[PDB]
Amino acid sequence: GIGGGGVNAVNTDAQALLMSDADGRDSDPEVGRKAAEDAKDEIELRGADMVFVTAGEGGGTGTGGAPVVASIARLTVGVVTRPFSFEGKRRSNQAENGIAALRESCDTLIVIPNDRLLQMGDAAVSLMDAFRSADEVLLNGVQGITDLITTPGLINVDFADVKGIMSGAGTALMGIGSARGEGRSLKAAEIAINSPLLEASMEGAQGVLMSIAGGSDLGLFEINEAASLVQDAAHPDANIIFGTVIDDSLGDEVRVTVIAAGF
């Protein structure tokens, strides 16, 4: 993530650029401008059709340097992070402006509040479990919607389906959930819509891309259970795209990742 707390998540400062796992150097929000902001043509976009922006708001240029990627071609949807309550008024003062161009020059954004992520863990955590125990959720809004095209499985979804509903959609939330043992797919879908993260606003939206993962074990009958919980669930006149995923490291778990759009 193009940020002094968004780099440390993916799995201007000199000692930060040199930890990017795939194979400048002189540093506040506006730091991303004459240390970060490079040319008008830096995607002459080449080898693929999307990449994501994991540039939240929990460090350095995650505010003034985040929307450097937003105007990159004014399709890409950023998976951000609104700051915790206790992380000061100064980081909260960098809230709207650090997201404003991420929802004026960028396609769509998924404003994952770690404030609300208090319900994901055990009881108490730390600042070190705000870019670690909030990587799990931070990958979700990404991985949820990549896996439909990279690794589908028992059901498939086009390139043009995601990019035909999640295109320039601006305001967007998600909602995730997990389950093992019986009822798996409907247990986790009923977690997915009730998860303190979609802010109970799916019914207001007009376009939802439900994902659902698990082994190749994953029955065709389980998938039909979750699918129903959507036709009732969202506005009864929306644009919904289902679709499945294969991940055989889950075995018995089924990663039901819902994503919202169309407010």
Ligand X SMILES: Nc1nc2c(ncn2[C@@H]2O[C@H](COP(=O)(O)OP(=O)(O)O)[C@@H](O)[C@H]2O)c(=O)[nH]1
- 46-65 positions binding ligand X, by CB under 6 A: 56, 58-63
Comparison of 74 and 85: residue with beta carbon closer to its own copies: 85
Shortest distance, CB of residue 128 to ligand X, whole angstroms?
A: 9
> Do the beta carbons of residue 192 and residue 208 sit within 8 Å?
no
Q: Are strands 77-82 and 170-172 parallel, antiparallel or unpaired?
A: unpaired
Please tell me the count of residues contacting its own copies according to CB under 8 A.
81
Residue among 83 and 214 whose Cβ is closer to ligand X: 83
Q: Which does 37 bind (CB under 5 to 8 A by kind): ligand X, its own copies, none?
A: none
The whole-angstrom separation of Cα 132 and Cα 185 is 26
Annotated binding residues: 4-8, 60-62, 87, 91, 135
* Contact predicate 120/97, CB 8 Å: no
CB of 41 to its own copies, least distance (A): 27
Tell whether residue 141 is a contact of ligand X (CB under 6 A): no
Asked if 239 interacts with its own copies (CB under 8 A), we say yes
Contact 157, 196 (CB under 8 A): no
Contact 65, 33 (CB under 8 A): yes
Q: Is 103 in the site for its own copies (CB under 8 A)?
A: no
Closer to ligand X by CB, 83 or 243: give it.
83
Of residues 155 through 214, those in contact with its own copies by CB under 8 A are 155, 177, 179-184, 186-187, 190-191, 194, 196
Q: Where do breaks (C to N over 2.5 Å) occur in the chain, by preceding residue number?
A: 11, 23, 27, 44, 74
Do the beta carbons of residue 63 and residue 94 sit within 8 Å? yes
What is the phi/psi pair of residue 194, to 5°?
A: -90, 0
Question: Which residues contact ligand X (rule: CB under 6 A)?
Answer: 3-5, 8-9, 56, 58-63, 81, 83-84, 87, 91, 131, 134-135, 138
